[PDB]
Design a protein around this ligand. Sequence first.
Ligand SMILES: *[C@@H]1O[C@H](CO)[C@@H](O[C@@H]2O[C@H](CO)[C@@H](O)[C@H](O)[C@H]2NC(C)=O)[C@H](O)[C@H]1NC(C)=O
Ligand SMILES: CCCCOc1nc(N)c2[nH]c(=O)n(Cc3ccccc3)c2n1
Ligand SMILES: CCCCOc1nc(N)c2[nH]c(=O)n(Cc3ccccc3)c2n1
Ligand SMILES: *[C@@H]1O[C@H](CO)[C@@H](O)[C@H](O)[C@H]1NC(C)=O
Ligand SMILES: *[C@@H]1O[C@H](CO)[C@@H](O)[C@H](O)[C@H]1NC(C)=O
Ligand SMILES: *[C@@H]1O[C@H](CO)[C@@H](O)[C@H](O)[C@H]1NC(C)=O
Ligand SMILES: *[C@@H]1O[C@H](CO)[C@@H](O)[C@H](O)[C@H]1NC(C)=O
Ligand SMILES: *[C@@H]1O[C@H](CO)[C@@H](O)[C@H](O)[C@H]1NC(C)=O
Ligand SMILES: *[C@@H]1O[C@H](CO)[C@@H](O)[C@H](O)[C@H]1NC(C)=O
Ligand SMILES: *[C@@H]1O[C@H](CO)[C@@H](O)[C@H](O)[C@H]1NC(C)=O
Ligand SMILES: *[C@@H]1O[C@H](CO)[C@@H](O)[C@H](O)[C@H]1NC(C)=O
Ligand SMILES: *[C@@H]1O[C@H](CO)[C@@H](O)[C@H](O)[C@H]1NC(C)=O
Ligand SMILES: *[C@@H]1O[C@H](CO)[C@@H](O)[C@H](O)[C@H]1NC(C)=O
Ligand SMILES: *[C@@H]1O[C@H](CO)[C@@H](O)[C@H](O)[C@H]1NC(C)=O
Lengths: 771, 771
Amino acid sequence: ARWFPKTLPCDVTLDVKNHVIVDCTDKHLTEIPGGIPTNTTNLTLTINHIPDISPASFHRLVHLVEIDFRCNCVPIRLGSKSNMCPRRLQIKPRSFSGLTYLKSLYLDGNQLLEIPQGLPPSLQLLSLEANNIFSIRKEQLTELANIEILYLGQNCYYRNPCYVSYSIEKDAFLNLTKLKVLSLKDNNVTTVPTVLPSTLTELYLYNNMIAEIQEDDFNNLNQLQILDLSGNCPRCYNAPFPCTPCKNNSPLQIPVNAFDALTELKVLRLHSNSLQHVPPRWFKNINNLQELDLSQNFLAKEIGDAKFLHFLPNLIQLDLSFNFELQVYRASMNLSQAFSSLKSLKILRIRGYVFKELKSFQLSPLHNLQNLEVLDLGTNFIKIANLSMFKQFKRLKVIDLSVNKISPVLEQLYYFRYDKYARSCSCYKYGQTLDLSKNSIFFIKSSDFQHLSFLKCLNLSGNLISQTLNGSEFQPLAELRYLDFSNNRLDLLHSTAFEELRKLEVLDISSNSHYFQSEGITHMLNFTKNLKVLQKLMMNDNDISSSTSRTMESESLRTLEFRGNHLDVLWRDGDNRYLQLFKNLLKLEELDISKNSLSFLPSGVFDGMPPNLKNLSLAKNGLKSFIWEKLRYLKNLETLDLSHNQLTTVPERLSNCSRSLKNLILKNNQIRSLTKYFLQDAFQLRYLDLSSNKIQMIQKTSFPENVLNNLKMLLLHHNRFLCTCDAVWFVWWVQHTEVTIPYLATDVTCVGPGAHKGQSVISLDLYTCEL
Amino acid sequence: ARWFPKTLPCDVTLDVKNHVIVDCTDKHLTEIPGGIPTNTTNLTLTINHIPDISPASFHRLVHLVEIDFRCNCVPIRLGSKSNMCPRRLQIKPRSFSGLTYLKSLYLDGNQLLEIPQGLPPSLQLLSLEANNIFSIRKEQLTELANIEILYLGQNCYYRNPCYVSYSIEKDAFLNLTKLKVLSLKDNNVTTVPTVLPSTLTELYLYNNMIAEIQEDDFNNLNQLQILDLSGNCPRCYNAPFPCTPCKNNSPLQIPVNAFDALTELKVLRLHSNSLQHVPPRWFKNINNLQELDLSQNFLAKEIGDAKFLHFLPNLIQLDLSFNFELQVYRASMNLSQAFSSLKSLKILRIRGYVFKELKSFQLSPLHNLQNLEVLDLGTNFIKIANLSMFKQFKRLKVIDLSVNKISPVLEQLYYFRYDKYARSCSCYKYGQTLDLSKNSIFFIKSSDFQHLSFLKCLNLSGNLISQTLNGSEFQPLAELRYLDFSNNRLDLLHSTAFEELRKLEVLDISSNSHYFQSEGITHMLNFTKNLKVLQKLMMNDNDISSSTSRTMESESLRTLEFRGNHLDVLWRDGDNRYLQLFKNLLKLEELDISKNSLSFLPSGVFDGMPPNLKNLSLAKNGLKSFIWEKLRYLKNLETLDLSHNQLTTVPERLSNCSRSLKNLILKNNQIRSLTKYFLQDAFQLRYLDLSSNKIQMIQKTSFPENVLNNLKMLLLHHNRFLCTCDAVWFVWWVQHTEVTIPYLATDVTCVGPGAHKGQSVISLDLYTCEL
Ligand SMILES: *[C@@H]1O[C@H](CO)[C@@H](O[C@@H]2O[C@H](CO)[C@@H](O)[C@H](O)[C@H]2NC(C)=O)[C@H](O)[C@H]1NC(C)=O
Ligand SMILES: CCCCOc1nc(N)c2[nH]c(=O)n(Cc3ccccc3)c2n1
Ligand SMILES: CCCCOc1nc(N)c2[nH]c(=O)n(Cc3ccccc3)c2n1
Ligand SMILES: *[C@@H]1O[C@H](CO)[C@@H](O)[C@H](O)[C@H]1NC(C)=O
Ligand SMILES: *[C@@H]1O[C@H](CO)[C@@H](O)[C@H](O)[C@H]1NC(C)=O
Ligand SMILES: *[C@@H]1O[C@H](CO)[C@@H](O)[C@H](O)[C@H]1NC(C)=O
Ligand SMILES: *[C@@H]1O[C@H](CO)[C@@H](O)[C@H](O)[C@H]1NC(C)=O
Ligand SMILES: *[C@@H]1O[C@H](CO)[C@@H](O)[C@H](O)[C@H]1NC(C)=O
Ligand SMILES: *[C@@H]1O[C@H](CO)[C@@H](O)[C@H](O)[C@H]1NC(C)=O
Ligand SMILES: *[C@@H]1O[C@H](CO)[C@@H](O)[C@H](O)[C@H]1NC(C)=O
Ligand SMILES: *[C@@H]1O[C@H](CO)[C@@H](O)[C@H](O)[C@H]1NC(C)=O
Ligand SMILES: *[C@@H]1O[C@H](CO)[C@@H](O)[C@H](O)[C@H]1NC(C)=O
Ligand SMILES: *[C@@H]1O[C@H](CO)[C@@H](O)[C@H](O)[C@H]1NC(C)=O
Ligand SMILES: *[C@@H]1O[C@H](CO)[C@@H](O)[C@H](O)[C@H]1NC(C)=O
């Protein structure tokens, strides 16, 4: 199709509007490549090893609005140790001054010593994170008259130290009269720099050495919407980063009138400031405040009083997590009545308060919060909770009691990680959720869930339930749609397990391997028959190698995840009792039987598949052979994943195996060559992955053009391609085709002959084959 | 050193006595190789694809006493499906008759139709398992006059069916006057063949279709020691193989006088015979009986009566496992007083009796069994057990309550597998063991172990213990040497955990990842300080990524398994706080920190290692780089396992890194070449593994002969060796060296230059490099 092969090692995209995008992210480049389109508006060269920039770099590219040149020399401790950057990035005079339309420049992570000068006046965003610029002078900032967004953080901290205090000249930023966003985080800053331009909307001063706020420090910032002063005087108990507290167990000292000017303030973040009190006076003139983070302080006592809450009626989120007093295990949670002032509250989080017994009345300040959607009391070591108290919280979307010690989405490192916003180079949607995951529930019965019939999802993942569920345990949960019972010890003695959950759409019993791992125990896998609206069943990593029932049954079920089991043993050659195990799942469209140690499939496995099977995975089975003809049985098969196996051959003619098949994944196999007519007339095919095999040669007969050209994608990388004159057609095709083939720049490569070893096939001149 | 290179693709061993052993096991052979030593006494060709035997096969090898020719054509269902055997093995006339000294012939698993004829009269052992010989005639057996051991089983069963009954001519075996061992198992046999020669010591008739024993069937077998009639009229409940019971739930019918002749019988096996009664009269004339297997019958009631036990005073092992009545959960275990008759009993196993409550008095028949060493009551769904009852079983070596449901070594498939003796082509030694693994113990306290101070090992692996152990939980266990606490949920709030176990030598707290997987929880890894005689600590797969203590401490500890954790995060670059985590384990000699996601090691890791470290593993870390010089810090290092990483290079001179190092494992890395003087003067070295890398070339400078020749082993297989004239020395060396290098037959191989692709380097003629 194409007249001129795209030889540029960067993805090029159009958009009309009106952007020409050139993305060279992570292309192992040591120079800016030649032939970048002159119309280029956005050029990305992130993660490469380009050691300098000069006026030659961008000469012809006068229409550039954005250059993203991040991480071409990242600080030693932040980057790869196998390929360390030898020397900081060199920027030569007048490299940017030509770029009359340049609006964004990202130079993060280049070990720069200074704010690059000679930048053009059209620049709105400038990002210099993770460099070694730790002294800002007014003179260096004059070029930035029209600047709106300025990221200067991570220039002096434990991952990238500068060994002195940050320095900011008096009034350095003042004459930047258009500045809206300033970030000075992770910098060893000692005082709020002043005076700052009043135009500011967002100010980020977190993770620094600021011991005191002066009452002056935010006087003029009357358009400020986000202030973050977190991690100045951090609370260091169990901190997963090196943590130095302020002397004398002191807090970040904030004058009572410090926030008076900030009438527009929407978000205030005071996490890890070692605060013992929260003075009401702080919020006297802020009534627009919507988000407040008071996590990681010493506010356990203040939670019982909290007079400041009366001043916060528009507040949408409040976080008081990890305010526990060291070495104290409270009997209960004392929430102040003041919590009842929070008319607009949607999200309340009080993780890590740390108390033994939760009781209904203790949440009564929350009863009339009409908008409350989330109550998060995770990680509290709660031992006792009458779950029925939550009958008064029907309106809530999520009740999170995750990670507690009861017996009858945020980052996994969120509250403790250093900078949760650091730049690198789920059943809630079913309705009301009670999350009881990672608790100590060993026994359940009906009354445990009394008054909880409104519940739509229940998370019991990671408890100790080790019990012969007979259909009586969950009887009140008449509206339950999703049950996560993963990481328990389900005993399937009774096929009546779970049948009381008459509205159940999704059941996860993955990682309940305990009772499947011992010989001679009963397992009623036919339990699915009773669940009339069950759509999705996950029974992964259960080590299932024996079953009392010969057949699983459902009129409703569509997806079955059966990965990480032992069908190899169930379908032991010579034993045909279980070949029809899935056949009576009549509406089953998706089946995952990857990770089942299936070296081979006995005859009968395919015949025994249910008739509407569409998406089949046999990945990661160590499969050494595959009778491809047997795909004829699966009359609606559209996706076949045979990734990560040991197949050495493809079918002689794929269209004689399956007429329906559209997506064939054969990556990470041992295929050495294709059959002479492999894809001939396979008109249904649309996605083919042959990456990470050991193919040398592809001839036209195997890959007819009329099939190839309707492929949405065709993955060929990491093979063993021989670039002799026999390869003439393949090479030509690859160079001139519109079909998307990833990694041409990077890992579609000749291994031989001699001359062309290691050379990418996109770049290959084979003119000597026509001389 | 050697004058003539060993080119035969088989391991050759001498022994004086006086055997020349040639082992060609699994060498992908399609012919018997040439040049087998004429003095060969034992030739093994197991698992190859040799399609026939003829007089040429063994012509010169007249001194052969044993031919093992197993599995060169295994039945379709038993063998590989990627390389199925096309056609049964052909044996030609007179292939064996020359072999005048032949004493053993194994022809198992070759799809033979008939007992190969023309065998020599010196033959003592003949094995024809897993063939298709399912009709034995007196005439075919006349060659075997002097035969002593005859294995004919697995010729007709579900893994290798023959579709008819087995047939044995009347008196077929009678004139084999020297026969001692006859095995007719897994054969669809319908009656005990008669008359059998009285010389028999062992008779194997298990897994067949024998409905009745005639009172005659064992009349003359007065030297018989082992009889096994198991799995005739099997009990089929939860059988993991296809299982057809005798009609009317009938048992194997055994006349009361059937065993009268068997005065020498030592072992009787009646497993899976659907027995409802055990008539005393059976044992009237057998007082030598030492082993009795009555597992998989319907003997629940009989266990309460068991009059037959009075006739068995010399019995050493008894097995009554899996005799439960279907659908019954007994309240208790009724053991007959008759159990007190068993003066010689060492081992009693009553798995799968199935009862709720175990109580002291119920074991009183066992109190005066002076020799009892093992009581196995595993897999009983016991809910309640005062563990103090075992104060009356101090003399026992093992009390096994594994796989039960309690709250406040044999095969994993042993009792249920088809043929536990099918041929394929641990803290007990510390003293008294109480195995409580895989139970439902969620809470422990002191009194749980009252009167149990004699215990030396306790297995609590795989319970639900989820508790802040403070040093009070195990207080009675004053002599305990080994605690397996693996697969629980240890909460290390307190550093006093386990301190009451003052004699503890080994602690396994592996797979207690639950509390290490959540953020902001305390973990006192310094808990080891209190354990004064602790030798070995296993804390594998705990996902440990944070720690309250900066240092682990012990004066005693020698081995620490810390595999499968997140030292990568603990030793996050820039964070120095945990670089000395193991330093104060002063006597630590072995450390495993494989599987820790260590892409690189920060500086300080090696400095912070304790001073007597000898065996260090960094396997399976994805390590991309390694400063080898830093090995100088580990002054007593002897074993370094860097297997399964991404190292691309070896040290310039290994002796400049470590003077102590003896075993260096670099297998499964990405090493493309060795340094010019790699092993120069490394006189301490003894074992070097460079297998599975991508090395092309090794020159003499890298591998000096004076280092090489003290190596006990040197692994080079699965590399990318180029066999040009530059390789002349390497090839010569490999052909003529006495140093052990495994897999020279199989996987030490040229990939090029072209001619020699796929040719083994042992066989390589490079004379053209000297022309
Ligand atoms: C933050 O600034 C302080 C100075 O305020 C740095 O601390 C100095 O570091 C050197 C070498 O580490 C010491 O010898 C000085 O005495 C330190 N001075 C003080 C006052 O502590 C600190 O390292 C800087 N932080 C970072 C991460 O670069
Ligand atoms: C040794 C197997 C006994 C019969 O099978 C079997 N399988 C299980 N999963 C349970 N759970 C379980 O509690 N039992 C005990 C039982 C036995 C009979 C009647 C009721 C309860 C189990 N028995
Ligand atoms: C979430 C912050 C609580 C402090 O750390 C922490 N870590 C643990 N592993 C436990 N186990 C545990 O039971 N607690 C609660 C506790 C707290 C103080 C005193 C006694 C008991 C824990 N607290
Ligand atoms: C192109 O640059 C403009 C200005 O920086 C930006 O708003 C737009 O999102 C960019 N598009 C990219 C990187 O694809
Ligand atoms: C249940 O909680 C677990 C463990 O905290 C989490 O992995 C999982 O996402 C939750 N399941 C659902 C369906 O939300
Ligand atoms: C289920 O078990 C509960 C108690 O464990 C019992 O009340 C109920 O009757 C049982 N149901 C059936 C159908 O056996
Ligand atoms: C399930 O398993 C078997 C039949 O295969 C039978 O014992 C049991 O009653 C069946 N129950 C249900 C609900 O299908
Ligand atoms: C060699 O064969 C003899 C006779 O069958 C046997 O007893 C001996 O175990 C064999 N030895 C080895 C090492 O294979
Ligand atoms: C055992 O014999 C019966 C008839 O006697 C036959 O139908 C059956 O197939 C045989 N079994 C096998 C496994 O060959
Ligand atoms: C268990 O039995 C012992 C006798 O050895 C007795 O001292 C103890 O009180 C019993 N404990 C319980 C909890 O039943
Ligand atoms: C404890 O029991 C488990 C089986 O439940 C086993 O794998 C482990 O090796 C046993 N521990 C010891 C120390 O023997
Ligand atoms: C362990 O570490 C803590 C400090 O992190 C200390 O309080 C405690 O006493 C130490 N315990 C032992 C047994 O060393
Ligand atoms: C080193 O450790 C491994 C197990 O971790 C062991 O198999 C090996 O024998 C040890 N080496 C020596 C020389 O003791
Ligand atoms: C390494 O070699 C150099 C030069 O031979 C020597 O000076 C140095 O001390 C050596 N280091 C060790 C650890 O042997």
